[PDB]
Amino acid sequence: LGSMKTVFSPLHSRRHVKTELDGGLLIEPHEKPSRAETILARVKDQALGEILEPEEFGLGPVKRVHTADYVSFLETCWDEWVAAGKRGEAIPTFWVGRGMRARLPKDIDGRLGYYSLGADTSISDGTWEAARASANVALTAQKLVAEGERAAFALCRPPGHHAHADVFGGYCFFNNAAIAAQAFRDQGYGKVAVLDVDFHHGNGTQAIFYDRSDVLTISLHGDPDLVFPHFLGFEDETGEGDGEAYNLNIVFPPDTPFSIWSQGLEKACERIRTFAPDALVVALGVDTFEEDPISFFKLTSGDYLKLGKRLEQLGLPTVFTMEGGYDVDAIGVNAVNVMQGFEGKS
Amino acid sequence: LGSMKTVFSPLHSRRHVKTELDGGLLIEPHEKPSRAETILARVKDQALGEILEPEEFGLGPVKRVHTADYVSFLETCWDEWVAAGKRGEAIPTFWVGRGMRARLPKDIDGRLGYYSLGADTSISDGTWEAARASANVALTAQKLVAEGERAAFALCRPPGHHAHADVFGGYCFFNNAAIAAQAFRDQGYGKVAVLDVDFHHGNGTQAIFYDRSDVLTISLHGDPDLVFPHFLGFEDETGEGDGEAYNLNIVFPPDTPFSIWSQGLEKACERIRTFAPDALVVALGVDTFEEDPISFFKLTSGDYLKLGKRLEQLGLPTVFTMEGGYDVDAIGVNAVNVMQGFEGKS
Ligand SMILES: NCCCCCCCC(=O)NO
Ligand SMILES: NCCCCCCCC(=O)NO
Ligand SMILES: [K+]
Ligand SMILES: [K+]
Ligand SMILES: [K+]
Numbered sequence: 001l002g003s004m005k006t007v008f009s010p011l012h013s014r015r016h017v018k019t020e021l022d023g024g025l026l027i028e029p030h031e032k033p034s035r036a037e038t039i040l041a042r043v044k045d046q047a048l049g050e051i052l053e054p055e056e057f058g059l060g061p062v063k064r065v066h067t068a069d070y071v072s073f074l075e076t077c078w079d080e081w082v083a084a085g086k087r088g089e090a091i092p093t094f095w096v097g098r099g100m101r102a103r104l105p106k107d108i109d110g111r112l113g114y115y116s117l118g119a120d121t122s123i124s125d126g127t128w129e130a131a132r133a134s135a136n137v138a139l140t141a142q143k144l145v146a147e148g149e150r151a152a153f154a155l156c157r158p159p160g161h162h163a164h165a166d167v168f169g170g171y172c173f174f175n176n177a178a179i180a181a182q183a184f185r186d187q188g189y190g191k192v193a194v195l196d197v198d199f200h201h202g203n204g205t206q207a208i209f210y211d212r213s214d215v216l217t218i219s220l221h222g223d224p225d226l227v228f229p230h231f232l233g234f235e236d237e238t239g240e241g242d243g244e245a246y247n248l249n250i251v252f253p254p255d256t257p258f259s260i261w262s263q264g265l266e267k268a269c270e271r272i273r274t275f276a277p278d279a280l281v282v283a284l285g286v287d288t289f290e291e292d293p294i295s296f297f298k299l300t301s302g303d304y305l306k307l308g309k310r311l312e313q314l315g316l317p318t319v320f321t322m323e324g325g326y327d328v329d330a331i332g333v334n335a336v337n338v339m340q341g342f343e344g345k346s
Numbered sequence: 347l348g349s350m351k352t353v354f355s356p357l358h359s360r361r362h363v364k365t366e367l368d369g370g371l372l373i374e375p376h377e378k379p380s381r382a383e384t385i386l387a388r389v390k391d392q393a394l395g396e397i398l399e400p401e402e403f404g405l406g407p408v409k410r411v412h413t414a415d416y417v418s419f420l421e422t423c424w425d426e427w428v429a430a431g432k433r434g435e436a437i438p439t440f441w442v443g444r445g446m447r448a449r450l451p452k453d454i455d456g457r458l459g460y461y462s463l464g465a466d467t468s469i470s471d472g473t474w475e476a477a478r479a480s481a482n483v484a485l486t487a488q489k490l491v492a493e494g495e496r497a498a499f500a501l502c503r504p505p506g507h508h509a510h511a512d513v514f515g516g517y518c519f520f521n522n523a524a525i526a527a528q529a530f531r532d533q534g535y536g537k538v539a540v541l542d543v544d545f546h547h548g549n550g551t552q553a554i555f556y557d558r559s560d561v562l563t564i565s566l567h568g569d570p571d572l573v574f575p576h577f578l579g580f581e582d583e584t585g586e587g588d589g590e591a592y593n594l595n596i597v598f599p600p601d602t603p604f605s606i607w608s609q610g611l612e613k614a615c616e617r618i619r620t621f622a623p624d625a626l627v628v629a630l631g632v633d634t635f636e637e638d639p640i641s642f643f644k645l646t647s648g649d650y651l652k653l654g655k656r657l658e659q660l661g662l663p664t665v666f667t668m669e670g671g672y673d674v675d676a677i678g679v680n681a682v683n684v685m686q687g688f689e690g691k692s
């Protein structure tokens with residue numbers, strides 16, 4: 001079995017929120033630290049390859065994707081929330097509704113809503129540090145691949161694919177896959193494809209490159225008429241201006257199994273083949289799993305071996321960034337199965 | 347000692363939600379049924395005038411302001427929420443963030459967020475019926491004034507001035523003041539002015555009439571840089587198209603007393619004079635009170651007598667619709683002081 005290096009930051013545990021708005025209640029959050037620990041434990045148990053801590057790259061590569069005002073806001077948000085007297089975790093209460101101005105207010109609640117697309121992504125102490133570390137995990141994995149490695153697994157937490165240039169939500173703060181893709185471009189890779197196999201639409205990634213043709217964005221995901229993010233991810237979203245035909249959404253209905261889902265994967269793979277990129281970033285969620293608690297696809301653990309194998313056949317230098325996946329007792333087997341299938345395990 | 351009739355619906359108590367999102371916690375809601383009961387008890391106690399229940403006007407006059415799809419959503423929201431397995435009250439978890447499509451999704455969570463500007467306005471059983479009655483309360487007070495009375499007090503609960511044609515929030519669902527103003531227009535009153543003295547900007551009222559010169563909208567409110575609604579209410583918002591110069595926002599900072607606020611009141615009365623309307627709707631909030639728990643002005647109970655005095659001097663047929671005010675100890679004295687001052691109390 002071939003080897004793959006994994007990049008992991010123990011600082012992920014700095015993000016350990018206690019509350020998630022879900023169905024009118026404050027529930028125990030899905031995107032929990034045990035996700036990353038269960039994966040890493042499987043990486044060591046399977047001897048997948050070397051495990052590295054990330055390098056500190058600073059905010060430069062982050063700000064090639066995200067606005068300076070947004071990066072500023074994430075650094076100060078918690079301290080301003082506590083200094084303003086709020087007693088819970090930092091959660092938006094109101095936002096720019098349809099018909100209101102996209103105008104940045106002074107107030108911390110106002111800015112919370114300005115910079116978000118959802119209320120289920122609580123911020124608290126350590127969120128800044130952990131989101132910073134997750135971006136560096138992606139960037140170190142990009143560095144590994146750019147310096148000779150065929151592939152590298154960025155064991156990111158928190159995930160990234162829902163974050164726009166200046167919008168957080170869906171458990172994501174910095175868009176690690178977009179940051180990795182932009183890092184390839186800044187280093188002289190002319191074309192980069194970002195393939196999102198997470199159950200949910202990679203709406204942040206779509207928006208970040210939506211008017212560009214140097215970065216092909218493809219997502220397979222549940223129908224947004226039915227699931228989050230609801231307001232992007234439809235198949236008619238093919239790109240704007242110069243980006244026209246450089247975005248591809250493939251949507252599936254509830255109960256979709258691998259025998260169907262992989263037909264979309266094949267169409268994604270053909271789209272990538274004709275684009276002929278110099279690098280590949282795979283935003284990898286395993287919330288396509290048949291027992292995933294918030295998702296409605298029917299992939300089995302063994303199907304992730306087949307997903308890994310199909311991605312290797314693209315023949316591309318490949319960065320995997322960890323996104324979703326919330327059935328914790330299976331998440332290690334599922335995620336590492338993709339890496340192991342990539343390395344030739346069947 | 348002149349008299350003024352009050353329209354009151356016992357159906358308001360059908361809205362009695364248990365939770366409000368606030369500072370990251372689900373707290374006891376501020377817009378509570380005892381607001382309406384405390385005002386009503388003070389109406390009786392001061393013998394202000396005859397009290398009557400509203401008439402049923404149907405959805406016709408409501409849809410002169412609100413879109414049919416929005417009205418349908420409010421009727422079915424709670425049934426769909428419960429049938430979908432949610433255990434809390436109906437609260438939006440995600441919305442159309444900046445960079446997403448204003449596209450109506452099939453999913454109820456999606457639609458909740460599409461139709462809202464905030465998450466502090468829970469929907470539960472009875473909300474539909476209470477919102478219907480509140481609008482009938484305002485339409486009944488409008489009927490009393492159009493049939494020959496100088497003024498009438500619509501004891502509306504829930505309030506309305508934050509609701510757009512198809513957005514709810516700020517504790518509001520149907521814009522009662524806008525509905526009354528439109529009823530005035532539909533009955534041959536050439537021009538109508540809506541004056542918002544609630545602590546918060548009447549963003550929904552502004553939006554509904556923003557491109558019109560036949561309905562003048564004025565609001566006095568706390569700086570939206572600092573307080574809700576945050577994304578409308580700035581003084582540079584003066585109307586668009588045919589509505590240009592027919593919207594007026596007057597903002598004040600924290601700690602503003604009546605001596606300063608009444609200077610803004612005078613600028614508003616002068617704007618009303620030069621508009622020369624055939625009718626006046628006053629969106630009356632007494633969250634301008636020095637003891638209001640969520641607001642930062644410093645009006646005294648006696649100041650409301652003076653505000654009612656000043657409004658009567660405008661010499662107009664006048665409908666008062668009840669908006670906000672959350673110090674329940676003083677809410678009856680404050681709101682009824684406005685009507686009594688209108689009738690000549692000092
Ligand atoms: N409490 C709200 C739950 C909604 C699901 C958010 C989607 C997160 C995700 O898994 N993105 O890949
Ligand atoms: N919990 C504070 C949420 C901000 C909304 C204020 C709406 C209250 C009001 O009275 N508007 O007139
Ligand atoms: K996806
Ligand atoms: K693109
Ligand atoms: K106001």
Ligand SMILES: [K+]
Pocket residue numbers: 555556557558559561562563585589592593
């Ligand atoms: K207007």
Ligand SMILES: [Mg+2]
Pocket residue numbers: 107108109110572573
């Ligand atoms: Mg605030």
Ligand SMILES: [Mg+2]
Pocket residue numbers: 291327328329330
């Ligand atoms: Mg399981």
Ligand SMILES: [Mg+2]
Pocket residue numbers: 226227453454455456
């Ligand atoms: Mg849903």
Ligand SMILES: [Zn+2]
Pocket residue numbers: 198199200285287323324325
């Ligand atoms: Zn996902």
Ligand SMILES: [Zn+2]
Pocket residue numbers: 544545546631633669670671
């Ligand atoms: Zn108010």
